[PDB]
């Protein structure tokens, strides 16, 4: 699941 809480995508 990709997540972007702060401007950057990570898994």
């Amino acid at each position: 699941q990709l997540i972007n809480t702060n401007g950057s995508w990570h898994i």
Epitope: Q1, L2, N4, T5, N6, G7, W9, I11
Partner: antibody
Framework: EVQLLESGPGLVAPSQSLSITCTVS????????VHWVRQPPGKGLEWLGA???????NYNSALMSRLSISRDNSKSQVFLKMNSLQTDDTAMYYC??????????????WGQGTLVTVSA | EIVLTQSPASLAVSLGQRATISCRAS??????????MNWFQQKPGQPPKLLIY???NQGSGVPARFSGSGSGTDFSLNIHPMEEDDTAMYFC?????????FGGGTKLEIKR
């Protein structure tokens, strides 16, 4: 029901500042990024910046020094402030949202937009 | 940053034919095995509507005749068969990294 609504000044004199409020309902700001996009009349979309779910911000490269974005989670409000507007800043100003996931709600909900005319 | 070059600037397509719009990025918009390329439709007097996310996935309320494709730096939106309500502005957008950026837009009209 995800909803966004812009409130802006309509008319701004050149060199004066712009303040727009995006009021949201149907989601919490701590779970979404809220993005600002503008569109000069008859021209293209321009990403101005965002306040991410974590509460940090990022901005358009060329306009960053004139732009400030903030939020008030308790009031479900996101704010755009822009300095010293000139005629080039005449545009429709939108807020839009996207969750922390990349899915079909990506920029799927927008406000109707508020038109800002820069003129004396 | 990642500059998106959208082509054509404008075109008209007759009913039932194919409209092809392209978006080329100055560098890859791929990461984690997917392409962060989005497409929007905008009708007069309306905010944009999401058509396509992740290069090829269709948004809610998006007819099958809208198809996105591509990877890396080269992407396309195909509309076929073209219908009357498809006259609109179309924009690509990359969301791989900040700043997010838009293509310059395509004005697509009906030839009749």
């Amino acid at each position: 029901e995800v909803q966004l609504l812009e409130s802006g000044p309509g008319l701004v004199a050149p060199s004066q500042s712009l303040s727009i409020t995006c009021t949201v309902s149907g989601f919490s700001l701590t779970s979404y990024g809220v993005h600002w996009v503008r569109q000069p009349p008859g021209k293209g979309l321009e990403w101005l910046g965002a306040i991410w779910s974590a509460g940090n911000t990022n901005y358009n490269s060329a306009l960053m020094s004139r732009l400030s974005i903030s939020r008030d989670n308790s009031k479900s409000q996101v704010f755009l402030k822009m300095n010293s507007l000139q005629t080039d800043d005449t545009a429709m100003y939108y807020c839009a949202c996207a969750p922390i996931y990349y899915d079909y709600t990506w920029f799927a909900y927008w406000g109707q937009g508020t038109l800002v005319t820069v003129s004396a | 940053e990642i500059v998106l070059t959208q082509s054509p600037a404008s075109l008209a397509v007759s009913l039932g034919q194919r409209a092809t719009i392209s978006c080329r990025a100055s560098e890859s918009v791929d990461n984690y095995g997917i392409s962060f390329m989005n497409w929007f439709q905008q009708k007069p007097g309306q905010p944009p509507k999401l058509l396509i996310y992740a290069a090829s996935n269709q948004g809610s309320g998006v007819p099958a005749r809208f198809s996105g494709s591509g990877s890396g730096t080269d992407f396309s939106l195909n509309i076929h068969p073209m219908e009357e309500d498809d006259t609109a502005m179309y924009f690509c957008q990359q969301s791989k990294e900040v700043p997010y950026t838009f293509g310059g837009g395509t004005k697509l009209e009906i030839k009749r």
